[PDB]
C-alpha cells in the first residue's frame, strides 16, 4: 500500500544523459524529504541527493555535483533525477527513498523508511545486444529420485539486467535463477532451473519468461522434455 | 565526512544461535539534546532494496520481529540476531543519519552454518535450435549443496577442459540453507561434433568421492 513505483533507466554512451522518475502512492510526497541512493552491481550503498519537501533545500554528493539535477512534483506525488554527462563510474541501481518524518527542511535527518524497487543504470559505449534462450530440457540425465530439473539458458545479452520468470509468475517453488557470469566475448550469460516432479513431466507445461528491457527483448520459450 | 566501518565483513552462524555484527564510526553520532544516536541498520537481500530494521540505534521498526535489535551510542554499535532464521540471511548495513553526507557502512554478509550436504548433479546436453546456429553449450547443475565450495571439472572425451567454462553460485537458500551451481561447458558445433563423451566431474565434502555425470553425442 505505501510505496514508490520507479521507472527509467538503462543503457546510455558515456557523456549520455538520462532521466528518473518516481511515483509514490499510499502516501504524500508533500511531507517528506526525498532522496535517491545508488548501488553499483557488487559494492555498498552511496546517497546521491536529496530534495525538502519545497524543493528550498537540495544536496548533492560530491561524486555526482554539476551533472545531476533531483526535482521533485508534490501535486503530482513525484519524484525525478535528471543525468547528465554520465560516466562508466555512475553504472548502479537508483533508488528513489524517502527519509523519515523527523526530516524537515534543513534539521537533522532522519532515517530512509521507504525504498523503491530500484532501476538499473548503465553507462557503457557498446550497443545493447539481446538475449539468445535456449531450452534445457529435462530429460533421464535431469532426473534424480521422483524429481526432475530443467530450464533455460539465456545467452549473450549485454546489458544487464535480465528477468526470468516461469509459467508468467506461476512457479516459483524449486526456482534457482542464477547470477549472470561474463563471457569472454564480453556478454553476459545467465541461466535459470527448476525442480518439478519427474510425474508432471508429460502434463504440466513449462516455460521460461525472459524480460530484457534494454532491447525490448521479451521470449518466453517452452520446455519440452526428453 | 563520517566513514563508517563494519566488522566482521562476513559472518556464518548456526541457525537459532547468535549473530552479532559491528559498526565503529569514525566520529560520535550521539546528539546531545535528545541524547539519541544517529544510526540506523537496514538488511539487504539478494536483488532486493534496504529493507529498515533499527533506527537511532536500538529502536525496532514496525514490523520488525524482536530477534532483531541493535546496542550502543557514540562510536561503537552492534546489529544482534538473537535465534537466527534461515531466512535472515542477507547483507547488513549500518548507516550514519548524523551529518551530512550520509554514508553507509561496507556491509555485512550473514550466512546460516549448516552441517554438510552432498549436491545433486544433472547435465543437460545443447539444445538443437542452438546447435543450428553454430554453438553448443553443455550445461552442468549442482542442486542443493553445502558448504558452497565445490569443483566442477569438465572432461571432453576424458580430455580435461579448461578457459572455456564459466560457472555460477546462487545465494544461501533461505529454507534450506543450501547452495546451487551451475557450470557452463561452450564449445563451437564444429568442436563439439568432434568429440562423443561429455563429462561433468563434480568433488565436494558432501561426497565420499568425486562424482561424474555424463552423456555422449
Known amino acids: 500500500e505505501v510505496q514508490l513505483l520507479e521507472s527509467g533507466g538503462g543503457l546510455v554512451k558515456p557523456g549520455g544523459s538520462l532521466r528518473l522518475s518516481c511515483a509514490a502512492s499510499?502516501?504524500?510526497?508533500?511531507?517528506?524529504?526525498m532522496n535517491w541512493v545508488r548501488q553499483a552491481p557488487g559494492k555498498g550503498l552511496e546517497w546521491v541527493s536529496s530534495?525538502?519537501?519545497?524543493?528550498?533545500?537540495?544536496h548533492y554528493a560530491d561524486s555526482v555535483k554539476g551533472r545531476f539535477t533531483i526535482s521533485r512534483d508534490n501535486a503530482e506525488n513525484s519524484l525525478y533525477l535528471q543525468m547528465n554527462s554520465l560516466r562508466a563510474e555512475d553504472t548502479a541501481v537508483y533508488y528513489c527513498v524517502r527519509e523519515g518524518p523527523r526530516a524537515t527542511g534543513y534539521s537533522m535527518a532522519d532515517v530512509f523508511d521507504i525504498w523503491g524497487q530500484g532501476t538499473m543504470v548503465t553507462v557503457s559505449s557498446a550497443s545493447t545486444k539481446g538475449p539468445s534462450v535456449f531450452p534445457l530440457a529435462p530429460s533421464s540425465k535431469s532426473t534424480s529420485g521422483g524429481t526432475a530439473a530443467l530450464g533455460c539458458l539465456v545467452k549473450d545479452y549485454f546489458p544487464e539486467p535480465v528477468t526470468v520468470s516461469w509459467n508468467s509468475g506461476a512457479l516459483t517453488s524449486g526456482v534457482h535463477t542464477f547470477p549472470a557470469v561474463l563471457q569472454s566475448s564480453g556478454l553476459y550469460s545467465l541461466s535459470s532451473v527448476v525442480t518439478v516432479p519427474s510425474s508432471s513431466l508429460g502434463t504440466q507445461t513449462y516455460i521460461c519468461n525472459v524480460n530484457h528491457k534494454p532491447s525490448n527483448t521479451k521470449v518466453d520459450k517452452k520446455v519440452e522434455p526428453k | 565526512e563520517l566513514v563508517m566501518t563494519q566488522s566482521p565483513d562476513s559472518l556464518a552462524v548456526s541457525l537459532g544461535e547468535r549473530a552479532t555484527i559491528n559498526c565503529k564510526s569514525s566520529?560520535?553520532?550521539?546528539?546531545?539534546?535528545?541524547?539519541?544516536?544517529?544510526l540506523a541498520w537496514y538488511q539487504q537481500k539478494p536483488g532486493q532494496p534496504p529493507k529498515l530494521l533499527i533506527y537511532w540505534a536500538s529502536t525496532r521498526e514496525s514490523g520488525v520481529p524482536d530477534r532483531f535489535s541493535g546496542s550502543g551510542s557514540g562510536t561503537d554499535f552492534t546489529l544482534t540476531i538473537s535465534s537466527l532464521q534461515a531466512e535472515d540471511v542477507a547483507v547488513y548495513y549500518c548507516q550514519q543519519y548524523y551529518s551530512a553526507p550520509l554514508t553507509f557502512g561496507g556491509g555485512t554478509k550473514v550466512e546460516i552454518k549448516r552441517t554438510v550436504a552432498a549436491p545433486s548433479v544433472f547435465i543437460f546436453p545443447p539444445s538443437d535450435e542452438q546447435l543450428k546456429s553454430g554453438t553448443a553449450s553443455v550445461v552442468c547443475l549442482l542442486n542443493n549443496f553445502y558448504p558452497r565450495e565445490a569443483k566442477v571439472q569438465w572432461k571432453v572425451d576424458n580430455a580435461l577442459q579448461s578457459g572455456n567454462s564459466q560457472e555460477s553460485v546462487t545465494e544461501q537458500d533461505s529454507k534450506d540453507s543450501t547452495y546451487s551451481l551451475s557450470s557452463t561447458l561452450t564449445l563451437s558445433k564444429a568442436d563439439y561434433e568432434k568429440h562423443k563423451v561429455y563429462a561433468c566431474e563434480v568433488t565436494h565434502q558432501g561426497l565420499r568421492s568425486p562424482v561424474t555425470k555424463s552423456f555422449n553425442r
Open positions: 530534495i525538502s519537501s519545497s524543493s528550498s533545500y537540495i
Open positions: 566520529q560520535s553520532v550521539l546528539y546531545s539534546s535528545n541524547n539519541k544516536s544517529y
Open positions: 499510499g502516501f504524500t510526497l508533500i511531507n517528506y524529504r
